[PDB]
Ligand binder design. Structure first.
Ligand SMILES: O=P(O)(O)OC[C@H]1O[C@](O)(CO)[C@@H](O)[C@@H]1O
Ligand SMILES: O=P(O)(O)OC[C@H]1O[C@](O)(CO)[C@@H](O)[C@@H]1O
Lengths: 322, 322
């Protein structure tokens, strides 16, 4: 294991730079040469592959985004395209590849380990959405959670001034974790998530009852994987007329300096990926499960919602009580 | 279990209000009357005990500090003093007491459960220092971690401009967790913690070697439980002369709006404390252990440092490499 490469694929998340930094610094500590692959899997195809030195990752732990960049590569599904990637790695004597990203990213890394005997691959879970198996939390979730909390805490100021209900759309793709964690954190009176049956009438009834009880406005926090905020607004309006606004938080949730949890998790996972490569392992995604750093085969990963936490959030809502 | 009381004791931490809110809202959800005790155990003695309603905890989840206040009560060590406290609870028909704070707080709650058959007690771990058993993380740690990261990220700007080394003192009482997590997070080149043998000469040697290698300045992050920053500075100066400054971060680390991790953990623990009281349990501190919500007897609590994480942080330091 003398030479490794690292790339970031899929949507960027805060903490991906800390993960790259830990792969780089851990590899160099162990006298392994490290190559950066730029623009994700597109980099493998275009041969945008460059040796990194210790200084290449200075001034990065605190930075959001990915300094390696990410670009989509749907053509990686063709075995002939993959052969070109493999040869661009093998031309340089690369023996291990670390991929930081989501499921897609892991599928490419699974193909590479299957199609090149001489390359081991390891995946590190990077996404704001918390939707990757093999880990309880993904790199970027904590940061995005705190981004949403900050934004909604601001919205709450204006909601309170005007007794204005807000219907706020959070990211998460098909996962409700961001909406659940953030909604509990901001005291959202209603949280709409794809993992729970949607009953707009019920939500309207709760809101109307609140008003009867002198709760004049509320926050509805809506996971995009369920519906759009604008759809929620339209559906509610069938049942009740309240003074409301829609907010779509958008790509702000993807950015920013990573929190401590993300910088530490990213660092732990990046160093462990390098350790796994040295130990001769392949085709595994790393993670933290029950507060332990673990590795899971891509098979088992491919082949989480905390209903108890959702129950709690509802108990804490004054609308559940009214 | 018809009537419960709640108090905050020991140093305040961000998230204590979210914990009080969850105890209040969970109790009222279960048709239990809740009483706030103000100024910690002093409140029990002065009978500063007032019924809370649902609205008493509005506008609190996001707020730092404790709205119940905290005040020291070393006289609680006298059994005659404790009898007055118990009677102020029993006069009102209180059957359960939730204490949010540290070890001290838990010692009082242990005495109360021993000395009053009719009162069950449960402790919730609230401290920035992460130094309470029965939990992997305390309420406030995540917030304080992110406070330190923000402060040191700023210091790093000025350090970089001037090639100035900073020796920064973090809180934590006798626990190095804050310094470790924050130090890894900011790329501190040296972290000084009470759990590891202190070798100032060694640290000086690493710094001097860095300079030889063109690393002109660094950050030393020092847990107060080891030594003061000013002591570290003085001891280093025996061995090397560098252009340096000392920063003591201080009580800023205690304040601020809690992060999502703290608001969610506080909420989970507050609701679980109420559940334990309903279930007939006593003399237990709650926590999260291996990502599961648990309860531990005060005995077992009274009767954690991640050396692997420390090892990683050192591997990531360019000074460890130079
Ligand atoms: O960056 P894009 O292509 O707009 O995709 C948006 C999606 O990406 C994510 O931000 C990250 O996977 C999702 O939360 C969101 O559904
Ligand atoms: O608030 P005080 O009495 O100055 O005590 C400071 C101590 O309290 C804590 O802030 C919280 O326990 C410690 O980190 C610190 O050593």
């Amino acid at each position: 294991m003398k030479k490794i490469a690292v790339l970031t694929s899929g949507g960027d998340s805060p903490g991906m730079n800390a993960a790259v930094r830990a792969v780089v610094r851990t590899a160099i500590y162990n006298e392994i040469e490290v190559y950066g692959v730029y623009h994700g899997y597109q980099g493998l195809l275009n041969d945008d592959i460059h040796k990194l030195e210790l200084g290449s990752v200075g001034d990065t732990i605190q930075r959001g985004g990915t300094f390696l960049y990410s670009a989509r590569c749907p053509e990686f599904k063709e075995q002939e395209v993959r052969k070109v990637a493999i040869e661009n790695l093998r031309k340089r004597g690369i023996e291990g590849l670390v991929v930081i990203g989501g499921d897609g990213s892991y599928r490419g890394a699974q193909r590479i380990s299957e199609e090149c005997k001489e390359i081991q691959t390891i995946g590190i879970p990077g996404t704001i959405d918390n939707d990757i198996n093999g880990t309880d939390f993904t790199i970027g979730f904590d940061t995005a959670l705190n981004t949403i909390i900050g934004l909604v805490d601001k919205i709450r100021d204006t909601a309170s001034s005007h007794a204005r209900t807000f219907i706020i759309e959070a990211m998460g793709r098909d996962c409700g974790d961001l909406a659940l964690w953030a909604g509990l954190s901001v005291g959202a009176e209603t949280i709409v998530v794809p993992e729970v049956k949607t009953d707009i009438k019920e939500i309207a009834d709760k809101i109307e009852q609140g008003i009867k009880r002198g709760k004049k406005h509320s926050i509805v926090l809506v996971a995009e994987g369920c519906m759009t905020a604008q759809d929620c607004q339209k559906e509610l309006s069938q049942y009740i007329n309240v003074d409301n606004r829609v907010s779509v938080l958008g790509h702000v949730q993807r950015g920013g300096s990573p929190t401590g949890a993300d910088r530490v998790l990213a660092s732990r996972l990046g160093g462990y990926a390098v350790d796994l490569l040295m130990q001769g392992e392949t085709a595994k995604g790393v993670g933290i499960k029950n507060n332990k750093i673990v590795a899971t085969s891509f098979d088992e990963i491919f082949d989480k919602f905390d209903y108890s936490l959702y129950e709690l959030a509802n108990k804490l809502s004054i609308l559940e009580h009214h």
